[PDB]
Design a protein around this nucleic acid. Structure first.
Ligand code: GTP
Ligand code: MG
Ligand code: MG
Ligand code: MG
Ligand code: MG
Lengths: 51, 14, 104, 360, 350, 49, 46, 286, 49
RNA sequence: GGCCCAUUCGGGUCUUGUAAUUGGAAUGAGUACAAUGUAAAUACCUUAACGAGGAACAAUUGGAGGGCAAGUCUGGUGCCAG
């Protein structure tokens, strides 16, 4: 049981480390794609409409 | 049904 | 013309008359009482849906437009002729899609 | 800490003002030197009325009963019934509720049971025709006191229903710097468990004094008979002088005791109405305490009320001092520019009070 | 003499009668274009009256009534101020002072309509600390998100809705209804990361001293003997005494077959008889819907950034996910609650 | 679909029989019960005739 | 006893809600419909 | 039917403006931006034009007479603190939103806008800096156009967005700063519900009035008596002591004493009262 | 100092809350309770509706 | 198996579907060395290198239909209807 628990905790810790990998080394925080385009909630649209 | 939704109350110590 | 010559009319939200109706997304729930600022007359207007009902709260400025119904609907309340198109200078549809925030 | 007061004096007002302000108060040295010290039964009942219409209030009475500490809550209201002790009539308890009802979360629908008249306290018709109209002037559009059953002393047995359907943010700013013109005199002569002749004998007595006036006089004969006539015999009269130009009113009231002449009571009350008119400028002496409070809890604006030289008595001063102790507001009195009379203008700045208990 | 006596003092009856034999002394008594402009005129008139009256009052009388009017440069003295404010004073950080109305002083349950911010990554959880900004004040609270269930009750929610408003109840200084606010989970720079820090947006709807949030509690039992409509159920209750309390209660199966708790069986303890509108199966599970009250935690942690030396690493109660990580605790999980793919065999009958 | 997000029209997944009750079989839902009730009423109708 | 009280309270509450909802719907139809028809005829007159 | 539509736009909700008729307070101008975007240099550049006196160091609010009857208070909000970004957002009459054009929008720039929108939107001016870092004019124009249009989503369409190229001697170009001073003067402030219902003031100085002997006989731990100066805003403050008041980041306190002092930076229009341009002697700084 | 004293009190208040969020929820809080899950004779005292 | 017509019952026609895997080519927006240009300079024209598989190098707007829960509400003549 302890072996299973350690595996689950380690998996979460690795995922948290992976999320921490995303933060830029430089101090400045840039707005992500969602904030920039501000597309909000839209339906799912086909790719054929793109052209 | 009176006590259901009350928090205060007159505390008489006489 | 319903607004005395205007295509849209400014108004002040007085009360959400259907706030206590049990059935969600009912026609009554989408009705809000509005006072036209031009002449002070009280009227009833439609909100697009209960989701848009959250953005509207008392004493806001609202731009009203005629509510045109193509055909009779089972749950409609005939007599309500107006729909809210903007609140606090922002489109409800824009707020409803999370493309804007209501400025207070 | 606590705003401290002395004695039973102004008990209801001090409790009422604390509730409106939200400031805790302490009242001490209540009848310390009496053989029976402390609160009276009707005062304890009045506190029981306060807790029933508010929520979160703490009211602790000393072991000896001579000190009360009150920490007001929020005005909630709702539907309830109050059993008035025989020591005081319903009007003793209905009157303070007029100060709080329009600023409640839920509508006040209170059923009061007990004696419906007395020599010292407000009557049913005094509230209906004398005080409630003042509330209507201040923005309380819908208020009603229904008389389901009348109860005369000593055995009482009456029943009245107070319903204030109008909930408002705060009283409007008042502006009355003139002397209202009286256009007609109205009134109600009522009697319980006695012959109909008595109510007619009052109106003859009252009409005797008022017939010299140049206005119409129409006094109602509201005789109560049957199951709803209460448990004891009693009779009384209430006269109201009305000014339809701005809906102002002045009134006088008194009831009859055993062995008293109905004609004399009609004459006495008719005389008192004229005396009240002579002593009034814009409101009666018995309406003045009600009007001033609604001025204090108005918006942050200067309201103006015209008052007479006679209305400034010992009672008037103790009211203003109590208000300042609670609200820190000062009433500014200035003379009018006229020379026909000695009236002043009482100018008060509202505290910007708002009905925050009401859900939006 | 006193206001308890409503009726005012009057002279003796015979004196008044003589006084009022003659009634001569009192005989003397007997366009804007738009609605918008009419309102503005009413406001301007009242503001004009204020200016006129204050001019009539003396300068000392004026200050006594209206108080120190805006634009005045004033010196205000305070006592019992924390020493850390004087010591850890940085002129770069502003000192903002705001007056409080009587309601702001009171503490109680604040009812608000609240939504997760659209740019916030994660949804908010009940009883999860959230730094709120009401009026002049900033503080950390534990809010409870609720739903009306078609305007019948205040039911506790587990999380904020993904893309809409939900009712929220939290304990804090009372504020007037219709006051908007915003919420943040983290204020310290160390924990800032890269995401958007504005978590919740909402508006206060009501103020109360108490609230009756309630959470659905379902009692589950299973059938062990079935006779057409009637069936005997087990595992719902522990003793026959409990069953008697719930006799006549409304119950149903997963299939939707409605029934009633008829009687408690003498043997074994806790078993009871029920009747259903139609015959139930052994595989079915019977449910009794019931409601259990929930209490708001009275937690108040004002954000005193200026008192701290750093002024930018204020930290309070942590989030549940952070707490679990620190003590290396697995996220609680129930195997039965997990969803699996369901393949249905074609239904045939004799 | 007018004035309805795709989030509102999200599938709600179906639950399964408890492991303790796995022996008794598949947990019947409303659609399964309708099959039983309809079949029984059909047979009883013919038998009554 | 408690079962009796709950049923009577629930029935009373339900009846009031239906009356209240009917009232607000009926009054809206009558007053706003009158203006709706009253406006429409002027447009017809025009 | 344009006339009817135009007349409609003139209509709003009737409101009460509590701004005093005589001697109104200086307006609070909050300079907000990411760290290193040029908050300090902009304040120095603006103050120099408005006063002709250059400040080597700026700390706390800075009051200047920018017009014949207009006074302004500039405040540099700490860019690393979110708690600061909240309480200025509740009092700022004008917000100079600095944006790094080369880098683009940042989180804290967007975070402040969301805070302001929910707590009462003030007047917002967008100021774009670091445009000299661009090497090509073509990309500069596209970058400028993208920033303006996104900025028009957060703030009402047609909102003014400025452009500052580079810094010389720690100052922006003199002409461009002149335009900034121009648009600040013409702009009009509308009342806000929360600012018109409470009294508030931004502290101009801070002072400790505790006796030094008390600090010794008992210790530094002893609570301190403090006097705070500043201009009053919003509704009038009651004269009598004991009024309950909240200081952001400290707690709730009661006013022990209060008194009015003569204006340290009086507006010239008042003095002359005791078509014409502002005199050079008339403009003051505090 | 007075500020330090209340910080200690808050730190005590934070610590207990951190433990409650970790602790397993009471039986009533858990949805779909069963006779085995809850304590015996609990329903008698709780006064549910 | 797809599609078409048809109120109705049904009728007509045939290479179709993938919500499967996979290959090498083409180039523009951009990132940009130059020269030409001009009083100088911007701009135009011309021109090295780099520049695509979620080609995430991530155009939208509007409309018509569905379907799902141990979910919630309402009216009833069980299991239904809204
Ligand atoms: N190239 C360029 N540099 C600029 C510009 N505006 C500011 N800077 C530089 O940015 C640096 C920081 O300027 P500051 O005025 O201190 O900005 P700040 O907001 O006060 O920065 P902090 O106080 O540290 O948070 C200075 O070295 C300036 O030279 C600009 O338009 N172009
Ligand atoms: Mg700086
Ligand atoms: Mg655009
Ligand atoms: Mg390919
Ligand atoms: Mg495109």
């Amino acid at each position: 049981k302890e072996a299973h628990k350690n595996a689950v905790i380690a998996a979460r810790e690795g995922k948290l480390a992976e999320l921490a990998e995303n933060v830029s080394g430089d101090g400045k925080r840039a707005i992500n794609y969602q904030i920039l385009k501000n597309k909000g909630l839209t339906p799912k649209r086909n790719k054929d409409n793109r052209n | 049904k009176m006590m259901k939704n009350k928090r205060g109350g007159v505390i008489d110590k006489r | 013309s319903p607004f005395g010559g205007s295509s849209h009319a400014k108004g002040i939200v007085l009360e959400k008359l259907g706030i206590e109706s049990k059935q969600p997304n009912s026609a009554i729930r989408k009705c809000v009482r509005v006072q036209l600022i031009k002449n002070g007359k009280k009227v009833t207007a439609f909100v697009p849906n209960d989701g848009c009902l959250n953005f509207v709260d008392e004493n806001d400025e609202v731009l009203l437009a005629g509510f045109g119904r193509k055909g009779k609907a089972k749950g409609d309340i005939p007599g309500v002729r107006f729909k809210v198109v903007k609140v606090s200078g922002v489109s409800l549809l824009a707020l409803w899609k999370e493309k804007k925030e209501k400025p207070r | 800490k606590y705003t401290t007061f002395q004695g039973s004096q102004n008990f209801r007002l001090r409790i009422v003002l604390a509730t409106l302000s939200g400031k805790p108060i302490k009242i001490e040295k209540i009848r310390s030197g009496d053989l029976n010290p402390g609160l009276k039964d009707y005062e304890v009942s009045f506190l029981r009325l306060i807790e029933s219409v508010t929520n979160g209030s703490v009211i602790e009475i000393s072991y000896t009963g001579t000190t009360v500490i009150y920490r007001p809550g929020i005005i909630v209201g709702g539907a309830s019934t109050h059993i008035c002790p025989s020591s005081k009539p319903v009007g003793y308890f209905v009157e303070p509720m007029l100060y709080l009802a329009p600023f409640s979360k839920k509508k006040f629908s209170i059923l009061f049971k007990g004696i419906t008249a007395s020599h010292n306290d407000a009557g049913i018709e005094a509230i209906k025709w004398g005080l409630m109209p003042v509330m209507e002037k201040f923005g309380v559009r819908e208020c009603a006191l229904h008389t389901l059953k009348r109860g005369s002393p000593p055995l009482g047995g009456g029943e009245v229903h107070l319903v204030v359907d109008s909930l408002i943010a705060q009283p409007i700013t008042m502006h009355e710097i003139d002397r209202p013109i009286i256009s007609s005199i109205t009134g109600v002569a009522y009697s319980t468990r006695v012959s109909p002749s008595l109510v007619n004998r009052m109106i003859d007595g009252a009409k005797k004094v008022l017939k010299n006036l140049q206005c119409e006089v129409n006094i109602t004969a509201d005789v109560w008979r049957g199951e709803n006539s209460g448990k004891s015999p009693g009779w009384g009269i209430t006269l109201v002088a009305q000014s339809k130009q701005k809906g102002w009113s002045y009134f006088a009231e008194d009831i009859g005791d055993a062995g008293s002449i109905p004609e004399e009571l009609g004459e006495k009350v008719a005389c008192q109405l004229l005396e009240e008119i002579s002593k009034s400028a814009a409101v009666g002496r018995n309406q003045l305490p009600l009007a001033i409070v609604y001025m204090v809890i108005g918006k942050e604006d200067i309201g103006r009320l015209r008052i007479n030289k006679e209305q400034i008595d010992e009672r008037f001063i103790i009211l203003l001092r109590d208000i300042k102790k609670i609200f820190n507001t000062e009433v500014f009195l200035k003379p009018v520019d006229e020379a026909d009379n000695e009236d002043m203008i009482a100018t008060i700045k509202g505290i910007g009070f708002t009905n925050t208990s009401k859900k939006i | 003499v006193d206001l308890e006596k409503f009726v005012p003092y009057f002279d003796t009856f015979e004196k008044l009668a003589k006084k009022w034999k003659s009634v001569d002394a009192i005989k003397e008594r007997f366009e804007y274009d738009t609605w918008y402009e009419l309102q503005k005129a009413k406001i301007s008139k009242q503001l004009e009256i204020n200016n006129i009256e204050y001019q009539e009052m003396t300068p000392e009388q004026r200050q006594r009534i209206e108080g120190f009017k805006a634009g005045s440069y004033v010196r205000i003295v305070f006592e019992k101020v924390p020493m850390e404010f004087v010591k850890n004073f940085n002129p770069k950080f502003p000192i903002v002072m705001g007056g409080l109305l009587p309601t702001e002083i009171k503490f109680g349950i604040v009812k608000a309509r609240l939504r997760r911010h659209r740019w916030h990554k994660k949804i908010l959880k009940t009883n999860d600390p959230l730094v709120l900004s009401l009026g002049w004040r900033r503080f950390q609270t534990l809010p409870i998100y609720t739903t009306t269930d078609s305007r019948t009750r205040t039911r506790m929610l587990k999380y904020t809705p993904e893309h809409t408003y939900c009712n929220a109840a939290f304990y804090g200084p009372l504020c007037s209804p219709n006051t908007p606010f915003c919420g943040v989970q983290i204020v310290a720079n160390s924990d800032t990361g890269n995401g958007f820090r504005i978590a919740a947006t909402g508006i206060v709807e009501e103020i109360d001293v108490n609230i009756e949030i309630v959470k659905k509690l379902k009692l589950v039992g299973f059938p062990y003997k079935i006779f057409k409509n009637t069936a005997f159920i087990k595992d719902m209750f522990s003793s026959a005494m409990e069953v008697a309390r719930f006799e006549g209660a409304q119950i149903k199966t997963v299939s939707g077959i409605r029934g009633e708790i008829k009687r408690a069986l003498s043997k074994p303890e806790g078993h009871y008889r029920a009747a259903f509108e139609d015959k139930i199966l052994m595989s079915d599970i019977v449910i009794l819907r019931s409601w259990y009250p929930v209490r708001v935690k009275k937690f108040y942690n004002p954000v005193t950034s200026l008192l701290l030396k750093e002024k930018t690493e204020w930290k309070g109660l942590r989030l549940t996910g952070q707490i679990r990580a620190a003590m290396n605790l697995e996220t609680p999980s129930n195997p039965d609650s997990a969803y699996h793919k369901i393949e249905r065999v074609e239904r045939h009958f004799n | 679909a007018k004035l309805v997000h795709d989030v509102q029209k999200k599938q709600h997944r179906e639950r399964s029989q408890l492991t303790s009750r796995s022996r008794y079989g598949f947990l019947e839902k409303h659609k399964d019960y309708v099959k039983r009730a309809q079949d029984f009423h059909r047979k009883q109708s013919t038998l009554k005739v | 006893f408690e079962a009796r009280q709950r049923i009577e309270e629930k029935n009373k509450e339900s009846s009031d809600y239906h009356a209240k909802m009917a009232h607000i719907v009926n009054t809206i139809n009558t007053e706003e419909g009158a203006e709706k028809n009253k406006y429409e005829r002027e447009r017809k007159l025009r | 039917q344009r006339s009817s539509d135009v007349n409609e736009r003139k209509l709003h909700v009737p409101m009460v403006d509590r701004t005093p008729e005589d001697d109104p307070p200086p307006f609070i101008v909050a300079v907000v931006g990411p760290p290193g975007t040029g908050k300090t240099t902009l304040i120095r550049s603006l103050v120099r034009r408005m006063t002709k006196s250059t400040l080597n160091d700026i700390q706390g609010p800075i009051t200047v007479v920018s017009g014949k009857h207009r006074r302004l208070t500039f405040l540099e909000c700490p860019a690393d603190d979110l708690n600061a970004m909240i309480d200025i957002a509740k009092i700022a009459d004008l917000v100079l939103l600095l944006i790094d054009g080369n880098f683009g929008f940042e989180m804290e720039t967007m975070e402040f806008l969301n805070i302001a929108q929910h707590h009462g939107m003030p007047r917002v001016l967008g100021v774009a800096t670091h445009l000299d870092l661009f090497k090509s004019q073509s990309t500069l124009r596209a970058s400028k156009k993208r920033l303006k249009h996104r900025f028009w989503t957060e703030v009402y369409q047609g909102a003014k967005l400025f452009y500052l190229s580079g810094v010389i001697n720690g100052r922006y170009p003199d002409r461009e700063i002149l335009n900034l001073s121009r648009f600040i003067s013409v702009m009009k402030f509308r009342p806000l519900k929360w600012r018109n219902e409470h009294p508030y003031m931004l502290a101009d100085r801070f002072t400790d009035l505790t006796h030094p002997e008390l600090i010794e006989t008992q210790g530094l731990q002893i609570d301190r008596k403090v006097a705070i100066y500043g201009y009053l805003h919003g509704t009038p403050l009651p004269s009598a002591p004991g009024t309950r008041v909240h200081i952001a980041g400290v707690g709730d306190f009661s006013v022990a004493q209060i008194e009015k002092l003569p204006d340290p930076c009086p507006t010239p229009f008042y003095q002359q009262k005791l078509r014409k341009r502002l005199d050079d002697k008339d403009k003051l700084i505090y | 100092s007075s500020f330090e004293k209340q910080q200690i009190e808050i730190r005590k208040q934070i610590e207990q809350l951190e433990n409650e969020a970790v602790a397993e929820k009471k039986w009533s809080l858990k949805g779909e309770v069963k006779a085995k899950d809850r304590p015996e004779d609990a329903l008698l005292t709780e006064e549910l509706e």
